[model samples]
Target chain A: GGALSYETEILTVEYGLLPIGKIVEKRIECTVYSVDNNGNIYTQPVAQWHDRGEQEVFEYCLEDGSLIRATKDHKFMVDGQMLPIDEIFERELDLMRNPGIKIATRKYLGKQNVYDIGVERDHNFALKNGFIASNA
Target chain B: GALSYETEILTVEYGLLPIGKIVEKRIECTVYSVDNNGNIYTQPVAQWHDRGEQEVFEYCLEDGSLIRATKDHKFMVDGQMLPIDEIFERELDLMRNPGIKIATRKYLGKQNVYDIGVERDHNFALKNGFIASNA
Candidate 1:
């Protein structure tokens, strides 16, 4: 009995002649839930989470780039759908017109996926062989 | 007193989309070297040249629908530049960088009449909803 190791080639649309080398970038973290032998459901990294008030929310840079992150409102996302963690909790964002920060809300499944399974857009324009990945 | 008419789709961009209706599929091949009587050189039931190559190498493909089985090397033949297939010898991996070499090769006047073949970057995901000649 041993842990399984997997390998696969993810394809990207290239503009011109094929290149020589390939590069591996980084790995991201995702929340996972698994069931134990007794059929008990459990979430990994059991720990305590605290929520700050809406006024304390701020913007942060994420993998695809930067975006405004709001104060924790105890929310859960499933299959790209965002829903309140509990009926007692309400989700809100600051999306609005003008320079004011708008906290838009989305449960985009795009948020969850391994780099290997997702598009890897390269920004290394300086490298003659550099390539980019895109969803469009 | 006989005349044959035909048309080759030179380009197909938007695909079946209303606006992309067959961009430019022009049929333009020539007799690289014609005989004294102005007859085409025949080889295996096909026309050919004697000293150089001849072919119709341009076509328009539907946006995200065009596929060339080979690269754009043939279109680069000048005086010093080599043929598309011969380019592989000069640059082992020209497919990765098809434009690194120079195109100064002169047309080898009347050698072999050539025909451009369909080539494409194979992405199984992109092979759907398209049409082509003989396919």
Candidate 2:
């Protein structure tokens, strides 16, 4: 499974959007933007995982020039489904209009210690950087 | 709500459904379940609430399925649903496909745990072919 790489901004409670590593280091909770069955987005409490971890990371550049770095197992909200970058790379899925990750390319950026956040029910976290890490 | 650690459930979210952890059991996704009669079904998940940190146990089934849950969490065991305490005390089995036997169980220490509730069925399935009750 993948972990959030360095330089990724996570939406958090009280601190606006902070670096993912910072949230883990501070042991803070997050305010998650969830969704209803009808796709209506809502807000909820998300707890930041206290234990820090590490993994090899990849740079996923979205079509809108937005960016995210995580392990291949780290997932994202694509349409309404959670997809791993591994599957995305294998299937060559499109990311054009969904405001999604670009199928264009990925840069394997070696490894680093990573952050894992505990998201509330909706299980999706919207980064301040326009990336929806619904299954992180 | 209940607390589960590392158990994945089958879910359908639009055209692209994926099996995700109970933590990833989305609020709007259709989670798979199997009834007492072995009928496979699916229902939208209603809740996935974190119960803070709790002591979790590791249960290994005959089919090689690993279930991590709190001692108080209920599961359908040997045709009767029971909590980990009684199930452990009684040396029961999971009434899954052909009533699979529980191989081993032990305390795995405290961890951030979670539970879930689905729609009508009040149940969901684990990724490794085990049907779990979310009721």
Candidate 3:
């Protein structure tokens, strides 16, 4: 059995895509909570949206769950709202007004899951390809 | 004269065959960086290709700067070192993926046409004012 604790205070929105012709839905930015039992792993969203403050408060049961990875099938969601790339670009532009620091914040909470999932998936792919590396 | 903060729109279209025809497409970019002495830097933010999740993708910022994020979580912005921020990393990831929804997309110069079927073989659904509606 394996478990890893993780937590952060950043907002995020999740979304998916369907080929070239599908209407999209936006999933709100919800915190991730992982539970473990006898090597079993389960996940549910926190009842609220916000940061966990300055402490690691969540655990991921990485021992036995479907591996996560990045997919190009959908646009990124913003606070549960489906955002077009243009809107996303605008958001980035807005953040730039605060200088480079805000964009740093945007990527943390916004794409934390993406980074975590992608790191895991990339590891697996690398293992299969006879290599190993870290993206962090 | 110092460079003033300015934004220019650049629209580039690909000929989604039926061949010899260009579809009007709109992508977004920006320019919001400045230097000492009130100089401005602007460039279009660009994400190209539909390589799906199998390969890496590049993003061009409004300042003509580039950020490349791959499926393996590797990210590098032009002239910058490693360990970029998570938000910047995620932005590149989002841009690389083709799954996000586009509202203003229509086929072959048609107006008010939604509900498209996007597949590998038929990338052009609005040719000749015809396409099956999905909604």
Candidate 4:
């Protein structure tokens, strides 16, 4: 059996919030690239991390293209009140963390602004039958 | 008076599939939650009412999963019709007559609204939209 070997190089940066509740911004420069078996080179942005202090904030984009931000204390919020996060959001985070998450084939919907949005897996099924986009 | 409501409108387009014919339908419903000072709480009900030439039905589950059913009563998931056996089992499970938890949380990292195998009364499960199925 032939052996396969590869090296993954990752870089991380962190920021801290002040005691007065102000988030400090930092600039850490980096260069990221990869070499494949055929010697083809690929490059992408360097990863960055932030500590956001005791409170964590998450931003979500709904199927209707509306944007909402949630804090750790209030996972989901609307009109300045807390609400429940949709299962789709939970599954998405799971998919990101776990490489084994099942993902069905999806169709590409082309570019929307800066995001290369697509109708993949649940999202693809959702659009076809007229369900909510995120839940699809 | 602190009395106001938020609405989300869903537009469902169906009839396009293996054959490629398509049509459009819009359903609008009201989802309500209360905002007191800076705290929020869900109301007893998240009401939905729709009026269209053809009714679009969605089976809401307590776990936040919604299943779309065709007009003739065929259940659809992931844009495909569920197998007959699955449909039957799901129907029975939705009945929740046994009150046994057929659903379970397979992953601790994920928090399912309805933990697996937790006993729930039939009426409570149905009203809360929690389906008892392999799903």
Candidate 5:
């Protein structure tokens, strides 16, 4: 298939959110999408707290990178314990305060410039196989 | 300057980890050689939750019409408890997650399908300044 369609749904499995400290919390809105070939897609899952960090979308492809079963929601254990597969993506635990909140009061994982230009690089690596990059 | 050189470090913080628990966390990474500018890029630095209300990301650009900086990151502070700027660029947060190995899980926020497609669109936006939306 050129571009696989997404069938999204909400999943709740007793997990903490990736905490970042007194920031805007959107509550919890997880949408899980399943592909045609028994694969799945996630809408980015977070930890219980808002600081621990969130999870990325996964695509389990057949060796040729033809796309096997992608999990776009979350692949974390319902108990927060790192699973064997967790070692693969490694980004399931990222969190930040607020970039535009304030320079002084605002605490970030990195600098402003460091955060401003990732889309292009992300697209080049994990995203290049499928979609395109926008702006930075 | 015309897609010259750009790089960034992104961090994704969420409130749905540790399985039913509530904690704050972060991910750091970088992207490079994005376009003709040779700038690196990162994916969507998001923090999803289980409550099913609203999931947000950091680094989404509020102003810049360019899609590159348009996907503005979100900050949900009640009344400016403490912060630097009022708005931020969302795409930048994705770059920060590269270093911390937080890219393990894949979701809609991290989808790469339109990423490549959007690049050409971005270039087109930079040059032509518009994509001629059917809407």
Candidate 6:
């Protein structure tokens, strides 16, 4: 029901990640962008869904040592095909050069801010490195 | 965010049957569901969400058909989206794919439940011939 993030998000200007919860709480004006599998570029609205609640999260470990965490239903743009946390395997998901190693699941300690960004048309957003996240 | 309980999702491999070994094996398959206008549709389903055990109920229909779902799971009752906890003691319509109407609902105690994801659309058909949605 939340974004596929472990407390960090990507920005357009650089290979960066900001604390997503901070941006939502402070109501900061920011820019988020998206790129399609066909190489089209688009600027997306910054706010999607935000909620503060207690929920479990799943961790995706990659062969390149990139770790991503999200709710079980959060979909990742895998090889241009969208797949949720529980459905993806360790085969690098088609875009990045790395293969997936494993996925782990556990409960978060307390209630935390859960949020996401909305991208139109493409329905995909950028993550650190070349990772792609699918918009729900 | 998805679903719980291994009910019959309209699919090709297992047809209209309880979700089990086939679904858990991660096989990409097709599932059929009906939209609000009583039109039938299909989509790809690769996984069933395994929500933890919880109290659930069985909606028994006038036609002797039934489905086990959680209180939070929404179904079409008399042309509106209503969760299981809200449907009781009334002759309700399930917006059934084959058009079966519900007669009564009762508690089924607690148990592990399962559900599936329909990315193309928000609705999917349950084995009990009722309509369930992503909302």
Q: Which candidate's DockQ is highest? A: 5
Better of 1 and 2 by lDDT: 2
Clashes of 6: 8
Q: After superposition, how far is residue A123 of candidate 1 from its true place, in Å?
A: 30
List TM-scores for all candidates, in order.
0.15, 0.33, 0.16, 0.19, 0.18, 0.32
Model 3: CA > 4 A from native: A1-136, B1-29, B33-40, B45-47, B55-79, B83-135
lDDT of 4 by residue, A76-114 (tens): 212222223333355432101100111112122222111
Expressed as tens digits, the lDDT of each residue in B5-118 for candidate 5 is 121221234311221122112333332223445343444433222222222223323222111111233222221211113333222222211112233233444332211011
Docking class of 5: incorrect
The weakest ten consecutive residues by lDDT in model 2 chain B span: B123-132
Which 10-residue span in candidate 5 chain B carries the lowest summed lDDT?
B124-133
lDDT of 6 by residue, A22-109 (tens): 5455545554444344634344445433443445555554432334444555544443444554455433333222111111211222
Model 6 DockQ class: incorrect
Runs in model 4 lying further than 4 Å from the true structure: A1-125, A128-136, B1-56, B65-68, B71-80, B83-135
Instruction: State model 5's lDDT.
Output: 0.23
Q: Report the lDDT tens digits of candidate 5 across residue range A1-136.
A: 0111131112223332221122113444332121111212222323222222333445532211222122332222212232332333443432211122111122223212212223323233222111122332
- Candidate 2 segments whose C-alpha is farther than 4 A from its true place: A48-52, A94-136, B1-135
lDDT of each: 0.18, 0.40, 0.22, 0.23, 0.23, 0.38
lDDT digits (tens) for residues A55-98 of candidate 1 = 32222222213221222232222222333222112223211111
Proportion of true contacts reproduced by candidate 2: 0.00
Local accuracy of candidate 6 as per-residue lDDT tens digits, B1-135:
112234444456555434333344554565554444644445555334344445545554433334444444555543455554444434444443222212222232322222223233322221221222223
For candidate 1, what is the DockQ? 0.01
On DockQ, the stronger of 4 and 6 is: 4
lDDT pick, better of 5 and 6: 6
Considering only chain B, what TM-score does candidate 4 achieve? 0.20
Cα shift from native, residue A80, model 1 (Å): 27
List DockQ for all candidates: 0.01, 0.01, 0.03, 0.03, 0.06, 0.01
